[PDB]
Design a protein around this nucleic acid. Structure first.
Ligand SMILES: [Mn+2]
Lengths: 99, 109, 79, 103, 105, 87, 106, 101
DNA sequence: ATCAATATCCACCTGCAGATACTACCAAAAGTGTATTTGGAAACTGCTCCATCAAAAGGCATGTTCAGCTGGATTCCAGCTGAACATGCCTTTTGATGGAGCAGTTTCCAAATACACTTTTGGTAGTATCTGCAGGTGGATATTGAT
DNA sequence: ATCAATATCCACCTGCAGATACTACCAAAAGTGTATTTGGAAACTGCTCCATCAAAAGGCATGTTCAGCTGGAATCCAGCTGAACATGCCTTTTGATGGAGCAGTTTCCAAATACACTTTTGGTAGTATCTGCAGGTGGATATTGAT
């Protein structure tokens, strides 16, 4: 049964996960979910892109994790940026000290 | 497999899928090892950030489940997200309740 | 009617949401012009996307890809 | 005939009341048919004999409508700046220009 | 005979402005003086980041950019007074020109 | 042999006559008393803005100098793309 | 024989090719691609000088400069909308003065 | 008494401009700054055409940009009359390169 | 201040559009050991380019007085517009069939590309002499402005 | 309508930085030619949802009377704002010395790539109970706007 099975992969299952890790009793409609899936794709491409250009001005080819730091730094407003950089240096150090 | 790279970082955002999406889009010749962790993390948080306020927004309007209207009200009422979505239109979002003050009854008050 | 298909009260309804008390008489036509500019502009881009993927049908992605580059990004349809 | 002074809400008040009503609601304020007609009438001139996935037309209806709304706040602001409260097309024309449309 | 104002030449209020509205428009040099617009590209920086230095020609680019702007922010702001049936630019003008641009709210 | 004195209140180096000429060229006639102050601020943000990007770049490929090209990205990327100074 | 000649152009048909690879806009580059491009780029270059060249004759100069280019670009419907977020470096501004700012009725 | 630790080449279109200049005006010069503006003109229009086709392909799962994507870009990216003539001018160049050899 | 005259907002009611719970499903997406490839990091250094001086001037900004008239406030009043009310046409939509066409799947070669030479060129360097026009002078005609 | 009193054009002129010009090497890039790989057109048909039919139903639009006031216009006095005129300062200018700090070439390995190969799981596809809530009903009473 693989015919109409061209995978429409999303973040919905991951969006709901994080939905609960803060508001466990609150739900999310499919319409509002879609927005929340438009958002992640959006915020991805930008940071991704701003880092895609960032290598090239420097004559580099490897998009290291540093690229992302700046990409986000350049991209994200005031305080809302100071936090992101943190949480993303948090997760990287965890992975660096992993199996 | 043994332990997901997601949980090896401690997240709910696929630190695997990112790494593919970054390779399929052609953003660089070589995506680093840290890159998709960082990127996923950063995304994950921002999505927590909205939802937080998007939960609260509904809880003000006596509701349990989130509608688009709960996103739009969440977003604009907050300065730094408003700028981050400064030029985005959420479908069926609506608009914040505001009326210009010169239009108030009895001349201007 | 088409462009006359958009109604004076609907315009008043869309204007009210903007936060407008008093709507002058000419507005209704001017707006109907303003509305066409937008549309012509979007669809032209959208249709150009359709025609690339060799199709006789405008997808709701042709539209996002269009509304994006226009400069009016729309969350809620992207997949 | 005669009516013995009935109720006639003072002008602008039914207007200023509708403002509150529509800002609080979110439903698309254009009849869907005439829109789905105007969408079909324009695109024909770019490609003849086409189709619109019902979402796409609404996607556009969310965009077109939501544009206008914002554009109307800019107008009203422009208008009030002339010390007025009635939006004339002379107002719209400034808002479009500044934004860079007629520009 | 006692009756005829004075004689010293005075050009009416506005007909030097037009003489200038005519002139700067004509050409192209930057209307902000270098050294003083320098110290502000030095200064706004060190306030983000100290020990940093600029290229003779970045500060020459940060000009023609932040210049240009005003002269075209002002472009938009003339337009605006004129629209309030005026001929004078008052701060509220700019602030409306900024808002609608999407520079504010 | 180094110099470097305190650098304060240099928005004044942007002077009323010049804040005039910008406004002359603007196509502008009668300059109210305030504009002079409102603009200087209006200019700070802009500089302020283009600069915490111009730098965020320099700060990156490990440099201590902001270049012509350095700015250009900080312009472009904000929707003010300039031709002339390169790239 | 060169790929410029091969195609008729002047704009480096090989050099635009590389920059479509080094950029990573997509993975694989076509054969028409880099040609079809150096055609556009050239045409435009060509377009904006049949303008900024005449610009120059109008004010009796005979060497193109930035300012001529501003008249060119700005006095021209399409180019102008192609260059709405561009900034011509020392290219003044199209002469223009609004109406209600003119002195009359003696 | 020449050359210092081989300086990297700043390969501009200065010459391809001037060559396409003299065609339009045989007896008109151009400054550095006049010019230096045109380079980033080229430079700029590139990034956009390429990039826009880059998008077209990724909305089509195409791992390649053909001259047909470049065209679609040009047709989206450029305003009206500027589009047509470029489109044609473009094909004309392809046409000639798929008729030699 | 009074009180009808209507629109507003709260608890309480029930039904279904629409989110949730369960299994079978399967390509493909991802993690895991292997073997190879080189990006970029380093340390050293040639070398352009910026900070910094210095000393001399001269257009340029400062402040100041003075008065032309634009902005702002006042009264006003004519006609545009909101209100409301009567029709009454036009959208709604559901409820479900042909049938396009998107979208899926097996083909198969023309088209990309990675591969190693070979010819060419366009950029820096170097030196060297032109030539377009800022720029400064002067004298004719235009604009503005008090009679 | 002049007549003085200014800036403004326009012409002629020079001085020289900024143009254009040859020689020269030359590392990289462009092209040529082969083996080798493969992305996507080429065409066939399965079904998801698009289009017009049907056909009520009344919600929502259009024309119409009335008069409330909002826009604009017409007059008038404060004092803002430009014009000008005297001075004097700090930018500008043209040049010269470290030398900071950028950049180009040599070396080497951690990390990243392609790859054969085992496994997990997110999307599909029905199938079926669950469920917060969108509209219905009081009956309150707040906001409106007449008295
Ligand atoms: Mn400081």
């Amino acid at each position: 049964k693989k015919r109409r099975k061209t995978r429409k992969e999303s973040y919905a299952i991951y969006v709901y996960k994080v939905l609960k890790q803060v508001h466990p009793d609150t739900g999310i409609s499919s319409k509002a979910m879609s927005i929340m899936n438009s958002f992640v794709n959006d915020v991805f491409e930008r940071i991704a892109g701003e880092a895609s250009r960032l290598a090239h001005y420097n004559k580099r080819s490897t998009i290291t994790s540093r690229e992302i730091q700046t990409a986000v730094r350049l991209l994200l407003p005031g305080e809302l940026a100071k936090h992101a950089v943190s949480e993303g240096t948090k997760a990287v150090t965890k992975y660096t000290s992993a199996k | 497999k043994a332990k997901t790279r997601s949980s090896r970082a401690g997240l709910q955002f696929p630190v695997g899928r990112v790494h593919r999406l970054l390779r399929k889009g052609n953003y660089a010749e070589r995506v680093g090892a840290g890159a998709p962790v960082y990127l996923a993390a950063v995304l994950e948080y921002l999505t927590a950030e909205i939802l937080e306020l998007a939960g609260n927004a509904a809880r003000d309007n006596k509701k349990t489940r989130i509608i688009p209207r709960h996103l739009q009200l969440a977003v604009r009422n907050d300065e730094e997200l408003n700028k981050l979505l400064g030029r985005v239109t959420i479908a069926q979002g609506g608009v914040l309740p505001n009326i210009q003050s010169v239009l108030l009854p009895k001349k201007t008050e | 009617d088409n462009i006359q298909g958009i109604t004076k009260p609907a315009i008043r309804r869309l204007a009210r949401r903007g936060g407008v008390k008093r709507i002058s008489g000419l507005i209704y036509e001017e707006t109907r012009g303003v509305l066409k500019v937008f549309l012509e502009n979007v669809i032209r881009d959208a249709v150009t996307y359709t025609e690339h993927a060799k199709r006789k049908t405008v997808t709701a992605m042709d539209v996002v890809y269009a509304l994006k580059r226009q400069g009016r990004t729309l969350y809620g349809f992207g997949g | 005939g005669g009516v013995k002074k009935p109720h006639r809400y003072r002008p602008g008040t039914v207007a200023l009341r509708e403002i509150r009503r529509y800002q609080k609601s979110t439903e698309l304020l254009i009849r869907k048919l005439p829109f789905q007609r105007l969408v079909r009438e324009i695109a024909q001139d770019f490609k003849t004999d086409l189709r619109f996935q019902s979402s796409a037309v609404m996607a556009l209806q969310e965009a077109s409508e939501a544009y206008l709304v914002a554009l109307f706040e800019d107008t009203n602001l422009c208008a009030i700046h002339a010390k007025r409260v009635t939006i004339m097309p002379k107002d719209i024309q400034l808002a479009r220009r500044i934004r860079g449309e007629r520009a």
